[PDB]
Write a protein that binds this DNA or RNA. Structure first.
Lengths: 255, 255
DNA sequence: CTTAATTC
DNA sequence: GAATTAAG
DNA sequence: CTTAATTC
DNA sequence: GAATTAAG
């Protein structure tokens, strides 16, 4: 029952995360950038009602907050099915174009897996839930990601923005990967015999024996929870000689 | 009056040419070729009446002759203007594909002109009329170029073919250029001080003085006429310090 | 909905 | 260069 | 007229 | 991939 032994480490029981050791992120703009305010494309009531629950949850969680910003990008009504479930998707392309580029340090899955020794056959795969939202944004950079939100009948002031690293921002994957690497540096040092692969929010822990993988997993979950990250108990693959990681099926040491 | 001094050398007074020193040409087929007989696309009366005079002239000249051949390619009604003058154009692409390739020995105009010394300022440009028709085709190769010709009211048997190198055949330019080079080899040897440029049917004779260009031109015209070639008196540019050759304007030694 | 590419 | 894909 | 390429 | 060019 890994779920009961580590309440804080799982999204299911530890609540929304927040990387407490990471300083709020400051997002540098390119040298010539000036704010861009793109009007919000009219949204149907169906889309608005579909998105509303999500916006309210984020406001309650403090991930979204009201604001007045010279920046504004549009929200899009996205429903994977034909017209089923919705979810807000922000078009941050005009913001991305004005943000200074950073070196892409996230390794491609192929190269990352090359660092997996044949000696480590016991695997544990964890995926961090709402990973980007665990990283705070400095108040100075929050206005950059503002969007409009209203209600034809008693709606918020006007704009809302993110207080955490947002989805759709070009540097989120890299910034998150780099932050988690800093937070897990000690863990690696304290567990020299363990192999830990990180691909943004997807983690692979490899060990030589089931026992080591057990103790190692316990230590990783404890560490992750303490740092403020949250893993999916639902999708978790604990101490298995066969696991699915980054589209690959790890078995017998193949792939 | 160069026209009167060399009756045989001009198309205007010497009649259709025939390169008497050149053996009738044999056209080798590719190793796997078999005859192809392409049906003649129906031709309107307007097109037929327009082409008729040309066919009759060629038959009278012996350039076209009746035949029965397993080969057949279509004739096309071509009228440069909107619907004015006509002229028969044969689509020999299927024949070209079955004929063995030869090395392209005709130099491009740019490289050909590089062999024109600044010392030779006096130019004479001649263009041979119906040049390809001056070269005979061996009877064994004549059937390759057959086409259909009839008259809704008393028409020739069925097919006609060429007894001379035809227009539209992929190797005609190269074969003609090579044949003329063989026929003018002696002339070059007999006139070491003269510069002679050959580009298929377009000739440029260059000399150091007007006198040399005069005597040289007289000798070239006499030689051409004797060999059976015919130049255009109409377009002839004799002993000029400025002439148009291959799209270029030769003047002061420029171009 | 808008848009940088990639196809047909 | 009017559609098709892929994406934010 | 049919066709190998090249554009839009 | 439906037009545009170029050609035999």
């Amino acid at each position: 029952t890994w779920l009961s032994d580590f309440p804080q480490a799982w999204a299911e029981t530890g609540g929304m995360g927040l990387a407490v050791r990471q300083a709020p992120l400051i997002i540098p703009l390119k040298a010539t950038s000036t704010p861009v305010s793109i009007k919000q494309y009219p949204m149907s009531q169906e889309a608005r009602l579909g998105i509303k629950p999500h916006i309210q949850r984020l406001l309650d969680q403090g991930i979204l907050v009201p604001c007045q910003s010279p920046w504004n990008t549009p929200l899009l009504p996205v429903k994977k099915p034909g017209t089923n479930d919705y979810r807000p998707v922000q078009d941050l392309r005009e913001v991305n174009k004005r943000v200074e580029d950073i070196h892409p340090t996230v390794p491609n899955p192929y190269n990352l897996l090359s660092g997996l020794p044949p000696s480590h056959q016991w695997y544990t795969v964890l995926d961090l839930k709402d990973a980007f939202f665990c990283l705070r944004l400095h108040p100075t950079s929050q206005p950059l990601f503002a969007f409009e939100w209203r209600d034809p009948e008693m709606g918020i002031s006007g704009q809302l923005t993110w207080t955490r690293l947002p989805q759709g921002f070009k540097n989120s994957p890299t910034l998150f990967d780099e932050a988690l690497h800093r937070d897990l540096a000690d863990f690696r040092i304290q567990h020299p015999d363990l192999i830990l692969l990180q691909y943004v929010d997807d983690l692979l822990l490899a060990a030589t024996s089931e026992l080591d993988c057990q103790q190692g997993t316990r230590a990783l979950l404890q560490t992750l929870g303490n740092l403020g990250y949250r893993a999916s108990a639902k999708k978790a693959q604990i101490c298995q000689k066969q696991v699915k990681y980054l589209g690959y099926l790890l078995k017998e040491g193949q792939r």
